C-alpha cells in the first residue's frame, strides 16, 4: 500500500535551486556539508509535468478575485460589476464577514490573504455562481459595506472539488478547514551522496560599445554553483490516494503518471545557463506493505571521493538494501532499473529493462 521510489541522479554544475543569495541549499549531514534540492521545488516540477500531461490543471494563486473578475468581464458584465461580484465571491465565505484581504493596491483587485489551490474549471464555476445572482450583487454594490449574498454551501462545495494534484499532494486552506485534503505523496529533500563544496564562478557582463572605463578597472559579480550525485526518495500512500480520488483506476493512472513524471522532471534552476537536464542513473521501486523505508542512512557516511561516485553509490544502496531486507523481513515487491551493467545488484529485486516497464510492472503489482 506504500509505493516508494528511490533514485540516484547526477547533476553537473547545476545550481538548480538557490537560497536567497544564490548559494545552493546545503545540509550538514553526517558531519559533512552536502548540497540539496529542496523538496517543494521538485514537487512543483513534478506537479507541473503531471498536470501538463494529464490535461487537468490546478491553480495555486493568491489573486483569485482578479481572475474571476476577468472571466465575469468576458461574460458581459461591466468592469465595476465584475469587480464587485468577485469581491462578493470571496466575501461570502468564512466564519467572519469574509476572507481576509491584503491592503488594496491602486488600480487592481485585492489579493487574497492565503493562497488557493483549486482546479481551473472550479474558478469558472465560481464565476457562474456569481453570475446567476447578478441583481443581488448590483444592488449590494451601492451599499457602503456589502455583505456576502452568494450561498455559502454551494461555494464551499465548489471549493472542495479535487484535481489530481490535490489528491496526490494535498491542499490546505485554513479559513475553510472542510476543504483541506491530506496529501498522498511524501517527497524527500534530494541531497548529494558525497560532500560537495560550493564552487564559485566569477562572471562578467560585457558592455558592447567600447569605452576605456568600461574595461580595465571594471569588475563584475561572482556567482555560486555546485554539482553532484543526488539521492532522491518519495512515497505514495496508496490507500489514502484511493480514498482521495475515490476510484481505483484513476489512482492507478495518477500513480503511474506521477512516477514517470518523478523520473522525467528537473527543477529548472538557471537551466538556461547550465542545461542540467539528466536522467537518473538508478531507480528502485518497491511496493511496501508494512511501511515505507527510505535509504538515506545508507549515505549518512559521506563518500570519500577521488573516483566516480555513481558506481560506489549504487553498490552502497544495493548493499544497504540487502541488509535491510535481512534485518526487516518483508514480502514487499522490489525492483530496479539501472544504466550500469557492471553489477547485478541482487538485493534490489527483479531487474526491469526500462523505467516505464518498471513503473508499469510495479504499479500493476499494487
Amino acid at each position: 500500500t506504500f509505493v516508494d521510489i528511490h533514485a540516484i541522479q547526477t547533476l553537473p554544475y547545476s545550481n538548480i535551486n538557490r537560497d536567497d543569495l544564490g548559494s545552493p541549499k546545503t545540509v550538514v549531514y553526517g558531519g559533512k556539508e552536502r548540497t540539496r534540492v529542496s523538496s517543494q521545488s521538485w514537487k512543483r516540477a513534478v506537479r507541473h509535468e503531471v498536470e501538463a500531461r494529464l490535461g487537468d490543471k490546478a491553480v495555486r494563486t493568491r489573486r483569485i478575485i482578479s481572475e474571476i473578475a476577468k472571466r465575469l468581464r468576458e461574460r458581459g458584465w461591466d468592469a465595476d460589476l465584475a469587480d464587485a461580484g468577485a469581491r462578493q465571491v470571496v466575501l461570502s465565505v468564512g466564519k467572519k464577514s469574509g476572507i481576509k484581504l491584503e491592503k488594496e493596491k491602486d488600480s487592481e483587485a485585492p489579493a487574497t490573504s492565503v493562497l488557493f489551490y483549486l482546479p481551473v474549471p472550479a474558478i469558472d464555476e465560481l464565476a457562474a455562481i456569481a453570475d446567476e445572482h447578478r441583481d443581488a450583487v448590483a444592488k449590494e454594490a451601492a451599499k457602503k459595506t456589502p455583505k456576502g449574498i452568494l450561498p455559502a454551501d454551494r461555494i464551499t462545495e465548489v471549493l472542495k472539488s479535487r484535481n489530481v494534484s490535490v489528491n496526490l499532494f494535498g491542499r490546505m486552506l485554513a479559513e475553510l478547514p472542510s476543504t483541506e485534503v491530506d496529501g498522498a505523496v511524501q517527497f524527500a529533500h534530494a541531497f548529494t551522496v558525497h560532500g560537495t563544496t560550493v564552487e564559485v564562478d566569477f562572471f562578467t557582463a560585457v558592455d558592447d560599445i567600447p569605452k576605456e572605463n568600461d574595461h580595465g578597472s571594471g569588475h563584475m559579480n561572482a556567482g555560486q554553483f555546485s554539482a553532484g550525485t543526488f539521492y532522491r526518495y518519495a512515497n505514495v500512500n496508496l490507500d489514502r490516494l484511493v480514498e482521495n480520488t475515490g476510484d481505483a483506476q484513476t489512482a492507478r493512472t495518477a500513480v503511474a503518471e506521477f512516477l514517470r513524471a518523478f523520473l522525467s522532471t528537473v527543477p529548472s534552476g538557471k537551466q538556461n545557463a547550465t542545461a542540467a537536464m539528466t536522467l537518473p542513473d538508478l531507480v528502485h521501486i518497491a511496493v511496501r506493505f508494512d511501511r515505507p523505508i527510505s535509504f538515506a542512512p545508507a549515505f549518512e557516511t559521506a563518500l570519500y571521493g577521488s573516483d566516480g561516485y555513481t558506481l560506489r553509490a549504487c553498490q552502497e544502496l544495493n548493499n544497504y538494501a540487502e541488509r535491510l531486507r535481512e534485518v526487516w523481513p518483508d514480502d514487499a515487491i522490489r525492483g530496479y532499473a539501472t544504466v550500469e551493467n557492471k553489477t547485478d545488484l541482487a538485493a534490489l529485486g527483479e531487474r526491469y529493462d526500462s523505467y516505464p516497464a518498471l513503473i508499469d510492472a510495479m504499479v500493476a503489482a499494487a
Binding site: 556539508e33 560532500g195 563544496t197 560550493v198 564559485v200 561572482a222
Partner: protein
C-alpha cells in the same frame, strides 16, 4: 604541539629565504600545488623533514612555499582574520570585497583553502601587512579535523577585531 614544528619552519625558512636566492626560487615554484606534484619536489630538500592527518603535510608545504613567494618589499597571539581587519582599517584596503573573499574561503575544503588562499594572503602581505605564519600553518593543519571550526574562528576574529578597532577610534 604542531605549532612547535611550525615555529621551526618559520625561523628556518624565513631565515633560509632572505639568506638564499636559489632555495627561495626553488620553493616558490610550488605555491598552490599538491605535495604530490613533481614540480614542488625541489622544495622537499628544505621543508620535508619537519612534517610532523595527511592534510598537515599539505599545510606545511603550502604556507612554506606561499610564504616564500612574496616580493622583497614584504620581507622584513593574533590570527589571520584580525590581520585582515587591521589591514582594512589601517592600510585602507577594500573592506566589502575582502569580505566576500573571506566568506568564500570559510566554506572551502582542505584542498580548496590552499587554492583560494594564495591570492588574499600574498596580496595581503603586499602593502606590508603583518601575518603570523605559525598560526596560519596550524590553521591549515586544522582543516584536516575541524575545517568549519577554523573557518569560523577566522571570520569571527575578522569581524570582532574590525568592530573593536572601529569603536576604539571613538
Amino acid at each position: 604541539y604542531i605549532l612547535q614544528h611550525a615555529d621551526a619552519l618559520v625561523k628556518r625558512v624565513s631565515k633560509l629565504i632572505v639568506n638564499e636566492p636559489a632555495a627561495r626560487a626553488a620553493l616558490r615554484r610550488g605555491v598552490g600545488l599538491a605535495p604530490e606534484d613533481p614540480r614542488m619536489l625541489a622544495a622537499h630538500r628544505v621543508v620535508a623533514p619537519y612534517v610532523p592527518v595527511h592534510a598537515v603535510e599539505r599545510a606545511f608545504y603550502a604556507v612554506a612555499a606561499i610564504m616564500a613567494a612574496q616580493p622583497r618589499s614584504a620581507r622584513d597571539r593574533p590570527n589571520l582574520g584580525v590581520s585582515l581587519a587591521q589591514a582594512v582599517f589601517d592600510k585602507g584596503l577594500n573592506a566589502d570585497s575582502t569580505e566576500q573573499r573571506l566568506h568564500l574561503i570559510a566554506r572551502q575544503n582542505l584542498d580548496g583553502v590552499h587554492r583560494h588562499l594564495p591570492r588574499l594572503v600574498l596580496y595581503l602581505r603586499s602593502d606590508q601587512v603583518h601575518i603570523d605564519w605559525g598560526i596560519l600553518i596550524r590553521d591549515l593543519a586544522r582543516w584536516g579535523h575541524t575545517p568549519r571550526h577554523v573557518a569560523r574562528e577566522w571570520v569571527q576574529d575578522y569581524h570582532r577585531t574590525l568592530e573593536t578597532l572601529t569603536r576604539q577610534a571613538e
